[PDB]
Structure 1
């Protein structure tokens, strides 16, 4: 067991192993984050102290869920776990959880907002998102919250996916980027959704990289749906059959019918191969959207595609999600996962 030291930073007590030095507050409802230098590995890191991890059954289960998922992710284009620790010496005194990851600088917002992106840059950035998603989806995990602020990028244009969906009603209301990248079937709860909700998000992000503008910046759920249907057309009977809410089907049928637009007249001047790929991602019927593995083999990525270097994940057991436990049982499971952690090479 390492030696810990305590300190108060911005009205919060931080007790961490000596290896972590020069802690500097950088952000704060799921927890507080400090930047630090990890003397063991030489990396600058983010250290997150979880806020009230075991205050309710819901919170204790969410803590366990986040820890299991971060321990599993081992891929160049996905954020991984460098360390996890508690200053507790026993389950009896266990109350605080700290998570350690690589410190991320820019996100994709800083890139698209204030940079000139060639088509070659768009190819490489979207390639890396799809490479990470093929890995994530192979474990039957759905990200659910892909958007530019959840994509870290460095000076060499290398990309990592972070901030897995693990949101409230108010946070999705109005003119907010938190909803602009969501597939319509989950935005309006049309049906039980698949992993291709993430592919819809990738299409929205690719369109924005190519044009410098948000694809579907709706002022509310209904305004955003209208923008979406103007581009991809209104649903045919085949998809309407798959929508569960009779009220939702009723609402859809009240709209005048519209054909799919010509994407070459929307994304003027774009690489024709990029246009072709967007038409395969931005399909209203989620059964018919291209998958991550299929998209990697698309001719738009011929420069980067290497089928011997696009790995899949080890199997991921999520049976706990249907389990009904007490706070102290979720807490004990989390404790076991903290003490069994093995750091990467």
Structure 2
């Protein structure tokens, strides 16, 4: 395969074209985890993870997403956010430019892998959830919403160092059996009910669900379908008042909550029986229907549950992410031109 210094191989029904420095590429799974490989970067002298962006320029929207992806990754450099160690393309020119590769640190596990293998002591959950909220605070202070925070988006290594993997970046990758795979267990109810004007607080609902799962070793709201998902949420938090319902759903999705029987809020002391009362208290500031009332990531880091790790001076905010570039309309060849330069510019 042309392009000096590059080599080809078939990995998960796709050809991978990588520089000679990337050695021993090993697929992580099939389908969803199928565009990600382990490798060893001979130049960096370390294990890395490599991601092959599927179809970055299939259409305007994919090209815009590809660009945003790169732009956010290198804007949001943080101890608890996944960082780019490299970007490349087998392209010899922009006519050849049709695929993008992202090389980061190898963490080697996610929160599912962790819940599955350990029991997860209260003290272990404090450290993990601290680092998630810390990464999130930074992400939020830039004006970015994840919107799909879940255990497979949160990476953890042996040293229990945690990194948030993406920013709700989902685009042209496999969405056959891999979107059927995409779990709704961690999604904010206001997103579930297609409220158009949600904010940062959607991710705090998700952290709530993630933290509850770490403590109990099982999913909090494991819905089997869309109605079941809402029914399970409402059975724990209680059905909202009409006034709260009016600001967490689109007009049409209200029916889905109005046709349920009125249910009181359950006592979280009994749901999370022998958990640290501090864990229970916090969860109750997270698993709130009124997105208004939900604690922010900043306020949460301040909770006594994280008093072991809270250091206000080591919990940075970011500069606003500038969207002036993405505010203007461009063609596909332009988003391409722009992404090519972004790929080319990398260290």
Q: Same fold (TM over 0.5)?
A: yes
Q: Does 1:124 align with 2:127?
A: yes
Structure 2: distance between partners of 1:171 and 1:16: 25
- Answer yes or no: is the 8 Å Cα contact 2:223–2:232 preserved in 1: yes
Structure 1: distance between partners of 2:94 and 2:176: 35
The DSSP-based 3-state class of the residue aligned with 1:135 is: helix
**Cα gap change, 1:12 to 1:251, in 2 (>3 Å):** closer
Query: Could you tell me how far 1:133 is from its partner in structure 2?
Result: 0.3
Q: In structure 1, which of residues 182, 187, 201 is the aligned counterpart of residue 187 of structure 2?
A: 182
- Answer yes or no: is the 8 Å Cα contact 1:232–1:259 preserved in 2: yes
Structure 2: distance between partners of 1:169 and 1:9: 21
The DSSP-based 3-state class of the residue aligned with 2:9 is: strand
Query: Could you tell me how far 1:134 is from its partner in structure 2?
Result: 0.4
Q: Does 1:194 align with 2:196?
A: no
Q: Does 1:146 align with 2:149?
A: yes
Structure 2: distance between partners of 1:251 and 1:9: 47
Q: Does 1:111 align with 2:99?
A: no
Counterpart position of 1:219: 224
Counterpart position of 1:61: 64
- Answer yes or no: is the 8 Å Cα contact 1:150–1:162 preserved in 2: yes
- TM-score of the pair, normalised by structure 1: 0.90
- Answer yes or no: is the 8 Å Cα contact 2:86–2:104 preserved in 1: yes
The 5 A counterparts of 1:133-172 are 133-166=136-169
Query: Could you tell me how far 1:88 is from its partner in structure 2?
Result: 2.8
Query: Could you tell me how far 1:18 is from its partner in structure 2?
Result: 3.0
Deviations 1:124-178, CA, capped at 9 Å, x for gaps: 11101000000100111111121111211122222111133126698676xx661
Q: In structure 2, which of residues 300, 309, 317 is the aligned counterpart of residue 304 of structure 1?
A: 309
Structure 1: distance between partners of 2:250 and 2:50: 43
Q: Does 1:39 align with 2:42?
A: yes
The worse-fitting range, judged by mean Cα deviation, of 32-41 and 13-22 is: 13-22
Q: In structure 2, which of residues 55, 73, 77 is the aligned counterpart of residue 74 of structure 1?
A: 77
Once superposed, what is the RMSD of the aligned Cα atoms? 2.3
Deviations 1:73-124, CA, capped at 9 Å, x for gaps: 2111110111111233433433332211112312111211221221100111
Counterpart position of 2:336: 331
- Answer yes or no: is the 8 Å Cα contact 2:119–2:217 preserved in 1: no
Gaps of 5+ in 1: none
Structure 1: distance between partners of 2:23 and 2:120: 37
Query: Could you tell me how far 1:260 is from its partner in structure 2?
Result: 1.3
**Cα gap change, 1:231 to 1:244, in 2 (>3 Å):** closer
Q: Does 1:246 align with 2:244?
A: no
Counterpart position of 2:100: 97
**Cα gap change, 1:264 to 1:81, in 2 (>3 Å):** same
Query: Could you tell me how far 1:190 is from its partner in structure 2?
Result: 3.0
Structure 2: distance between partners of 1:318 and 1:228: 35
- Answer yes or no: is the 8 Å Cα contact 1:29–1:51 preserved in 2: no
Structure 1: distance between partners of 2:135 and 2:16: 33
Gaps of 5+ in 2: none
**Cα gap change, 1:257 to 1:4, in 2 (>3 Å):** same
Structure 1 stretches of 4+ with a deviation exceeding 4 A read 27-31, 167-173
- Answer yes or no: is the 8 Å Cα contact 1:4–1:15 preserved in 2: no
**Cα gap change, 1:49 to 1:250, in 2 (>3 Å):** closer
Aligned length: 339
Query: Could you tell me how far 1:40 is from its partner in structure 2?
Result: 2.2
Q: In structure 1, which of residues 274, 277, 280 is the aligned counterpart of residue 282 of structure 2?
A: 277
Query: Could you tell me how far 1:3 is from its partner in structure 2?
Result: 5.6
- TM-score of the pair, normalised by structure 2: 0.90
- Answer yes or no: is the 8 Å Cα contact 1:127–1:301 preserved in 2: yes
Structure 1: distance between partners of 2:243 and 2:178: 32
Structure 2: distance between partners of 1:95 and 1:328: 11
Structure 1: distance between partners of 2:36 and 2:253: 41
